Amino acid sequence: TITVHPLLGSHVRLTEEPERHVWQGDVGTSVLSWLSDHQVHNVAALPGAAYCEMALAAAAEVFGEAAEVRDITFEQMLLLDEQTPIDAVASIDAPGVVNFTVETNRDGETTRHATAALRAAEDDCPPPGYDITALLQAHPHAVNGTAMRESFAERGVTLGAAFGGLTTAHTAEAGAATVLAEVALPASIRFQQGAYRIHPALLDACFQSVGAGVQAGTATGGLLLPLGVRSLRAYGPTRNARYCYTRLTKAFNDGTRGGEADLDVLDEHGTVLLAVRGLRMGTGTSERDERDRLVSERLLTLGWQQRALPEVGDGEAGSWLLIDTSNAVDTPDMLASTLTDALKSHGPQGTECASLSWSVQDTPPNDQAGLEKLGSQLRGRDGVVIVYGPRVGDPDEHSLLAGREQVRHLVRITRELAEFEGELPRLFVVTRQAQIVKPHDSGERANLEQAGLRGLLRVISSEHPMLRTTLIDVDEHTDVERVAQQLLSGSEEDETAWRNGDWYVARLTPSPLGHEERRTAVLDPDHDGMRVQVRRPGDLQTLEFVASDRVPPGPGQIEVAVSMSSINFADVLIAFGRFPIIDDREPQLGMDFVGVVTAVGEGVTGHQVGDRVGGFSEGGCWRTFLTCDANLAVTLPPGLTDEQAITAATAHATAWYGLNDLAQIKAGDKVLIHSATGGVGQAAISIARAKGAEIFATAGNPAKRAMLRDMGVEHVYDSRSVEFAEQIRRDTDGYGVDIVLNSLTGAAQRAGLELLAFGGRFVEIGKADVYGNTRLGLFPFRRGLTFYYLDLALMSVTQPDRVRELLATVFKLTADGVLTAPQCTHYPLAEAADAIRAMSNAEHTGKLVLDVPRSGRRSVAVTPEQAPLYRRDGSYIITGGLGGLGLFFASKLAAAGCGRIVLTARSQPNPKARQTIEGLRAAGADIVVECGNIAEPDTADRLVSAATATGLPLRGVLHSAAVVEDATLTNITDELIDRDWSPKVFGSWNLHRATLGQPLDWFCLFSSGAALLGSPGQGAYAAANSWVDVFAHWRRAQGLPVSAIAWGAWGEVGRATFLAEGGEIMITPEEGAYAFETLVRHDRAYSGYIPILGAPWLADLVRRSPWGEMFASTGQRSRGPSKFRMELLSLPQDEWAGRLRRLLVEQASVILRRTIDADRSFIEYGLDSLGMLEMRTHVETETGIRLTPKVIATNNTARALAQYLADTLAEEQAA
Amino acid sequence: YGVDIVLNSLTGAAQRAGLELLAFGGRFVEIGKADVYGNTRLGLFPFRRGLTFYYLDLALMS
Amino acid sequence: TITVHPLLGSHVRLTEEPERHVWQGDVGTSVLSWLSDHQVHNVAALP
């Protein structure tokens, strides 16, 4: 009786053209038990092999046997909760070509899981076989295929039992396309193989072969998933099969992307059963997104947090040692004396301590003899603390020397301290406002001289980990009580700041850019140009002004100062991130505009400056200054005020067109207007009254209907339901209507279309139906209908002259008073956030006019990634250009064509440098070289003058001079300290002073990751780099532009890069070029771009660093018990959501490989909709509630998604 | 660029192909009652470009 | 009991505008012999 296919289910034939085969059925687990086994992160999912088999069955049905499919695609995954209706449909679009698409229409929306083409395109040409005795003997070297499957399952996507068959394999090597596995249907799958054209389980295993084929030694943290195949063909039933050919053509070694496999299924005899060509796994995103991700997973910063002291008190017997060092101040006693007194009093038990008051450059014998007074017989007694005391709040030009002396003092004293045979004491260090913490009491007034210390102490903490190197920053208004408490029983914390009456601790935080660090600028609407544009299409709460750098008009252009624009349904659609993009150019907000001409183009003569103007344009009209094509603007006749003109445009310009120049409305012609109360509807009402027609209409809620009836227009009916057609039919005796200015979608469309009576005109202005392939029934057209479509914006862009004439006509008519402008309700343009809300919910009637603020309203606008980077008419100076990264950055600047970049270094260039310079000059860059030591003020003055006196103002700088050197604590010499100190400190300070007056746009100061991380390789470099870090913070505090970068190493794999990646030079130059070009635009002062999130030394930092917030978090091995998280609903559900926050962040951390905050967005760090797959599946498994890949996007922030889950679970709790 | 005026008289996939062909503002004039009286389901969407569909039948008009 | 209906073939809900139920059944004395006896007008006919 029943013979339906199991996956597809029913097959029903439609005779309507284009001929369509519609397949419907259930693919739930309850029906097909075996389906349950592709638990991706422990949740059932339909394998792509299922899509392949289903497409093959559809092709066989439509074209009989020996017909195959091409260019398959997979688009979304599935969930298969219990039951899952599936609606596979195939259409005969044109003879000889067909299309096949599978989608699920549950929950009220569709999801095109896979698209296909089933053109037969096959002939009676049997495929050739393969030689068993050859392929088997070629690659017999065995490999643990079953263990490979087990590890691949552990990787996150399990296979269960039904998807077995893939047998222990053999290959020439791990990394070659030679895997020789064997495939057989598991016992539970052998039975029903007849119905299928090759079991989806067998095809899935055949695919799965690619998992072992790619790389047997797969790297941890990588996930792959098949995505589409270029072609397919099924030759014979797979009642029996042995192996699938392992022909792979992967362009691998990038970790992901594809593999372009061509699997061929063949039996024991060598004959082939099914052929697949062009198989790709895990495509990911475009190259631009790859570079964007590479920036997320590297930017670092010093994150500070507030906490309480868990020490409370313990251990006792705090007989530490103290040294009052470099305290040349008149009265630096209080800090040391108070600390000693608190230690004596509050310190439990005996707390004897002594002071080795080694002042700055006290006396020669103090180097050793002065220290041995206590560091000889009782050295390293139970703990030591260094106190540095206060200092002046601002730096003098000569203050640099003092910092050098301080670093010399620290290196000497610490080398002496570390030279103790017995176990070393923990090295406390208290410094006064030498570390910049956070917006809470942080900014200017940082003690620069002490600032360089941080890097040295941090490198020490790695060089000699035995002496725990905790260092504490302190503030005037913190009081010494909790400071003494930290001294006494301080827990294992490395770097902390007592910035106020509160404890602050540091955690190296992976902090990608966002929306709070975009460069802010001060603009004036009166003459400065700024635009409005949604930052995050979808949540209109993010509307924010943006600088627009008004460009002077060109030929055929005008420069109009907007006075008021109007919302329009296109604006609403774009605001909610729902516009039907069609030309890879997202439309800007606003369509119309009314303002005054401020400048005149070259080739234009229609109008002059100082004259009013109106019209619409693309490029966004929600601006203070707008530059639109001159041909697309109409002078305002004297009658119209600005308000009337803005209200009329796009209301009459639509209504007048549709009803007059297309439908040719005449006296006594029945008209039907949908959504009359809207602006377009109101214009239509006015037009109909003017031309003398019977004005039917329909509205929304009853209040609007009553209001419209108050206007005198009789025959008002509800628009929500289709009932209006019948009612109007009753009230007209059959002659329903002659014109329909439809603007609603859905069933109403058909009713309106059928309403017309033998005259025919259907002007359609809606947008939902047309961009949806609404596929209307064409039968009602038999009675002389005529269907129009009227998209005013598109007409304006393509046929400016016609819309220009139309606009002139409507304005002239409005001035004469024959037409009345609709009702208006102004809003301040800065308040667009709520205004858009009214339009969508339709509580306000009439056109919403936005009144752009054109006044002296001084404000802060935000410059997006489109920021001033390479401006032609300015000079750029690069220091140390003649060596290392300088050459590469100089070449990059030349490529950008920057104007007359100045290049300098400390010495004459080498012959290769001269060759590169002359070549770049020949390339067209007007680069000029200089020389001299940057540590000299004269050199800086000469450099700044040369770049300025040349005639091109200097605005960009890049101080990159540095030389890499290696040293260890003991052998660190003073000359090394000086030669590291001068290039960074003195050069940078001189550059800042000399350039202080110029109109700079950035200031890039290079640094090393050592100052941030701490590498035993070098310690002298760390001090100078930390100093330049703090100096950059201070400069930003002063308000001048600045940006400090801490570079790192080249490879993320260590020395294995030579074998696995090959010898390469520099520090990932191309990778860092984009990072620099981006980071120079944003505002954050300090940032560390270093290859972390997986790297050799990270294994060491996590151990030696008590902060180490990056962690490893190797606890992803969830199990069946993990469900208890749902069972924790016994506790209060609000508190349950509070803990759900932590669940979410922890689960996200493993996939992201780093701890993220709960306030930012997941998309910021970068997830290829595969990190999204993991997150969604894990959320469902750990909570039993599902969130669609759509609703996750809007709630991209951890807080948002947590609140959404809390609500969607409290609803269940209520049930 | 495509065509502008299409005085179609074919049926089946021919008219569907024609409707996609014409450029912006093209006016797809129709005279062949065959497809229309069969309640063909026109793939309304090529109207994206501001097309206009007419049906012309001399006898009924008269 | 049996999902298919003898006089209608296979039920299918098409989620189009408007929603349609399309069945595409088959009938015939060749397979549904019980129709043969109702030979209306001395010719095979649909009851």
Numbering used by the authors:
A (entry chain A): 892 to 2106
B (entry chain B): 1626 to 1687
C (entry chain B): 892 to 938
Give the published text.
We also obtained a map of the modifying compartment DH-ΨKR-ER-KR-ACP (3.74 Å) from the same dataset. Complex C demonstrated the modifying compartment (DH-ΨKR-ER-KR), with ACP crosslinked with DH through 1. In this complex, 1 covalently crosslinks the ACP to the active site His929 of the DH. In contrast to the extensive interactions between the highly negatively charged AcpP (helices 2 and 3) and a positively charged patch of FabA, the ACP in MAS shows only limited interactions with the DH domain between Thr2072 of helix 2 of ACP and Asn933 of DH. Arg2045, Thr2046, and Tyr2056 (ACP loop 1) interact with Ser1187 and Glu2000 of inter-domain linkers (L2 and L5). Unlike the shunt product in complex B, there is no probe observed in the uncrosslinked DH of the opposite protomer, indicating that the reactivity between crosslinker 1 and DH is facilitated by ACP binding. Unlike the narrow and well-defined FabA active site, MAS-DH features a deep binding tunnel to accommodate the long, branched-chain acyl intermediates. Surprisingly, while the E. coli type II DH regulates the substrate specificity via gating residues, we observe a major domain rotation of the crosslinked DH in comparison to the apo-DHs in MAS complex A and MAS-like PKS modifying compartment. In the DH apo form the active site entrance resides underneath the ΨKR • KR domains, providing no access for ACP binding. In complex C, the DH translates and rotates away from the ΨKR • KR to enable access to the ACP.
